[PDB]
């Protein structure tokens, strides 16, 4: 049958259909539906036992300047400041895993970190276009302390709502006039937190 609409609503929720015999209700079959979802199933990322759904925004906004980085990087909830380079991506249906190599860490986290060990990161499929990630390029990011996910030492940093990831141009791109200011601000901010760091 035809289902009409009357008002445009942002971030609709999926509906469900439940079929059951008139005498027993516990032997029912509930199936969801949604125009842009698989079986009306909210996007959650799992490792066979533990989940935290990511029906949120990949990022906030991208504009951002040196003062913006200063105010949004000295937050009480930030834990690590890491620069990485994209090496391998494992595209799939449920999620995608990004494996990086660490050059050097601006800020230390509660997990054992050193130059050389591999790190994995997970994001929902909705970030496949917003962040336009590309391989063989450097990046710098900081995020919420609730990123830890997995078992030691193969933990992962989930790119959730509070996770902030920004493009770190290499030497070749830092020579471009468009990104010269961004590269200089990134270097100054890096040395700032290396020497002095956030107050308190």
């Amino acid at each position: 049958f035809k289902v009409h609409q009357y008002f445009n609503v942002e971030l609709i929720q999926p509906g469900a259909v439940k079929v059951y015999a008139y005498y027993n209700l516990e032997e029912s079959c509930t199936r969801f539906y949604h125009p842009e979802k698989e079986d009306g199933k909210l996007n959650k990322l799992c490792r066979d036992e533990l989940c935290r759904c990511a029906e949120e925004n990949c990022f906030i906004q991208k504009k951002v300047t040196l003062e913006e980085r200063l105010d949004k990087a000295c937050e009480p909830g930030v834990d690590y400041v890491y620069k990485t380079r994209l090496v391998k991506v494992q595209l799939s249906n449920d999620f995608d895993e990004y494996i990086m190599a660490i050059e050097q860490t601006i800020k230390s986290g509660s997990d054992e970190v050193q130059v050389g060990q591999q790190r994995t990161f997970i994001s929902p499929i909705k970030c496949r276009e917003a962040l336009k990630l590309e391989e063989k390029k450097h990046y710098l990011m900081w995020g919420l302390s609730s990123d830890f996910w997995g078992e030691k030492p193969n933990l992962s940093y989930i790119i959730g709502k509070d996770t902030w990831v920004e493009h770190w141009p290499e030497e070749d791109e830092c020579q471009d006039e468009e990104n010269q200011k961004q590269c200089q601000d990134l270097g100054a901010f890096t040395e700032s937190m290396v020497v002095f760091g956030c107050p308190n």
Binding site: P76, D79, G197, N200
Partner: protein, 706 residues
Amino acid sequence: SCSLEGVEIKGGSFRLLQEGQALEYVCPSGFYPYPVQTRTCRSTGSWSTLKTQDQKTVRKAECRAIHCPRPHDFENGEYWPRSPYYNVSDEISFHCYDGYTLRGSANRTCQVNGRWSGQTAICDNGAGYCSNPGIPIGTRKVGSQYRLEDSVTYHCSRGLTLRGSQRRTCQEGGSWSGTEPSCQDSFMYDTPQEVAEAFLSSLTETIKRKIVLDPSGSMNIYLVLDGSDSIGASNFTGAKKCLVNLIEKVASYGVKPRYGLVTYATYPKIWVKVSEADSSNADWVTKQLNEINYESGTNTKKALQAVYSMMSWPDDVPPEGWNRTRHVIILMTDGLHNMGGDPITVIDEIRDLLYIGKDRKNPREDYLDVYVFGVGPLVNQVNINALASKKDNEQHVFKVKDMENLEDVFYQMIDESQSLSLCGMVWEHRKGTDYHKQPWQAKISVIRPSKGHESCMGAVVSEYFVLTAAHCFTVDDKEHSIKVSVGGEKRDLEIEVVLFHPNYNINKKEAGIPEFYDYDVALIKLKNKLKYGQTIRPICLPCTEGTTRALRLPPTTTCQQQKEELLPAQDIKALFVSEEEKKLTRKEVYIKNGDKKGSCERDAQYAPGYDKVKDISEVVTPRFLCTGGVSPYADPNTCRGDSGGPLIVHKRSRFIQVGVISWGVVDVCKNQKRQVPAHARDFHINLFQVLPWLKEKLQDEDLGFL
């Protein structure tokens, strides 16, 4: 600094502290700032955003009335009455169902501190391995199984933070592993008295008290400080005194401990190690304690890793005394915003080195104790609680309003072992009575023929003299017509003499003024000596050696300096004791000794017999003190039966009386529970204007007069 516009508080006052780096909100009793207390002037030119629990937008900053946490649940019973919110001094009766026995306080009223008076009320049936841990107010319990190895979960409602154990597991001894949880707020602070009581109870064993150890064994203390960018002024002003007093006090229990000193701003620094030969001597450790200087951030993980290195040994086989030594870590962090990880893992390492978190047959949980003291309003209670230790019936996590309470705690701990001779000593007993909080108060009853009995009160200042008002008595009264009661005792004490000021006269009759209160003071000399008791205990007097040592100053300090310190040319905090339904309480009152004095003295025109006085200054002598009213803060008035009480200014956990209540503007006190004029003020008689008379009459009491 940042812009000062649009940062004030409605219904309160704002001031610039740390040279404009911060601003603090304050209102008197019954009001606390909402939703925050302080804002930080960042480098963007604007202060820190108004952050709520859900991080919402705030239209304006106001200081909201003090309410009291609602019971999130009370299983197996009822509470009476039930309200969406509970006011100050509201009372609940906790009633159990049938077959459930109550444990705790049934009649519970919650004071201005924000917690209900007494122990948490529990109804238990007693049919398990361990008992009901209780359901504290605002915290709700998950798990009705009280067998062994069963654990229960506690958590708070909206706006409340949990301090205690997130999950308690029943132990094989029959107890629960962890401290009793509670729901806390940002405005709530622990008073220094109960902090000292809990610190003594956890550290010592009651008999007096003692710090026992394993035979042929010693203990180690790790005093750790924070060099955060919050106060860090003048080489830890007060903190050094706190640590010196603690070191002196612990050595007075007959045991010689060992010490270690850690301070960190950006990297940890080692001052004393447990391996030093002279680490068991108080003199040298105090001397090095006085040699601490600044050279930012808060890197607690690295500092406690340094402490870990101190604890650890370099030998292959474990050294001697590895399982016969007790470790105490004391941390005075004002910040603890993590930078470099969390310090939980290093605590796990520390307890794994000592074989604590590996077996349950020999837990050995009592060989490591971590105490963390919270300073300032920028504290994160959950992080402190997760960093400190937790053992049942003991409190390892504290919190104070200001740095002053930090040394108030330790001065009280020093004074605890002192002889009962000195004045100002009041111990906050766990199961105290009414007079356990105000023991100096004494009540005087006057019986007159065919006339109503007159009830007044005064302060016991020695073993033979009681200071009171003089208008409560007349020269017509005989010796047999005065009765004195102390500490709620039926037995009376015979009187010997009452002394009045030579210039005092209760009869300006021709000047049109009906009543005058010049030098309205009375000194009652007792027939016998007073035996010091739990609720009978003297009070100090201004400009005395006892007052000099009370304010923690050298004996060379002058009386004028004491007057300036206790009574500056600004607003002065104090409180007066009131009686309501055979019970005693404290009402906070403020003294106006600056610009507000001249206006306040005018309010006496509202008093009876003062409307026709031509010279308003004549009736108000400089020896009077004008308090109360709504300016600059709302102050309750003294009641008709409350007149003549002692006005006392509290300082360093010491009670010093600064005057005697004389009269008031209007008698509208009974409206407090039921509408008070803004001109209602209370006038009291100062004690600094009768110093020669006090010295003359009280020269045989050995009070160290200056």
